[PDB]
Design a protein around this ligand. Structure first.
Ligand SMILES: Cc1ccccc1-c1cc(=O)c(O)c(C(=O)O)[nH]1
Ligand SMILES: [Mn+2]
Ligand SMILES: [Mn+2]
Length: 175
C-alpha cells in the first residue's frame, strides 16, 4: 500500500506530523494515501531546505501548529519590518530577508509556479519537481547548488521508490 511506503521511507517525526495534520482536519491517511505521501514529501523538503544553513539562516514554519506558526511570523515581521503574508509560508530567509513558499509538484514546474504565484504577495517562490527540475522567482534559487542537489536527489529517490512499488502512476496523477 502507499501508506506502508510512507511509514517505510520517512523518519517518524514527519509521519507523526503528516498524520496529525490530516486527522485533525478530518482526513484519513489510510484512505487519502497519495495525500499522506505528498504531505510527508513537502515537509521533508521544507526541513531539508531549512537545515542547509550566518549559522542559523532559515526559520522553519511548516511543521508548526497554527498558534506557533503565526507567532513566529508575527515575531519576524515585528523585528525585521517585512510585510505579513495572507497565507502561512514554509520558510523565512534571515540572509536574503524575505519569506519562502516551497512547492513540490509531479507536474511541470512552471505550471505549479503559476498556481502558487496566483494564490499569494511578496513571498519568494521555489518549486521542485521529482524530475530534478526547479523554478524560483527571478530565478533566485536561494541555495548553493550543493544543497539544491540533495533535495532533487531525495525527491527523485522518493519518485523512484514509489515506482519500485508500482505506486508512481497513482501518485503522479493525483495533483
Ligand atoms: C502538501 C499539500 C497537500 C495538499 C494540499 C496542500 C498542501 C500544501 C502544500 C504546500 O506547499 C504548503 O505550504 C501547505 C501548507 O499548509 O502550508 N500545504
Ligand atoms: Mn506552507
Ligand atoms: Mn509549500
Amino acid at each position: 500500500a502507499m501508506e506502508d511506503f510512507v511509514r517505510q521511507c520517512f523518519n517518524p517525526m514527519i509521519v507523526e506530523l503528516a498524520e496529525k495534520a490530516m486527522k485533525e482536519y478530518g482526513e484519513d491517511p489510510k484512505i487519502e494515501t497519495n495525500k499522506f505521501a505528498a504531505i510527508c514529501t513537502h515537509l521533508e523538503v521544507c526541513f531539508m531546505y531549512s537545515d542547509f544553513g550566518l549559522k542559523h539562516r532559515f526559520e522553519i514554519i511548516e511543521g508548526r501548529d497554527r498558534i506557533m506558526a503565526w507567532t513566529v511570523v508575527n515575531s519576524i515581521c515585528n523585528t525585521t519590518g517585512v510585510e505579513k503574508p495572507k497565507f502561512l509560508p514554509d520558510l523565512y530567509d534571515y540572509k536574503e530577508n524575505r519569506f519562502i513558499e516551497i512547492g513540490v509538484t509531479r507536474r511541470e514546474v512552471h505550471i505549479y509556479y503559476l498556481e502558487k504565484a496566483n494564490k499569494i504577495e511578496k513571498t519568494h517562490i521555489h518549486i521542485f519537481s521529482f524530475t530534478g527540475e526547479e523554478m524560483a522567482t527571478k530565478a533566485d534559487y536561494t541555495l548553493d547548488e550543493e544543497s539544491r542537489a540533495r533535495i532533487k536527489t531525495r525527491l527523485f529517490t522518493i519518485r523512484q521508490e514509489m515506482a519500485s512499488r508500482s505506486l508512481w502512476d497513482s501518485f503522479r496523477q493525483s495533483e
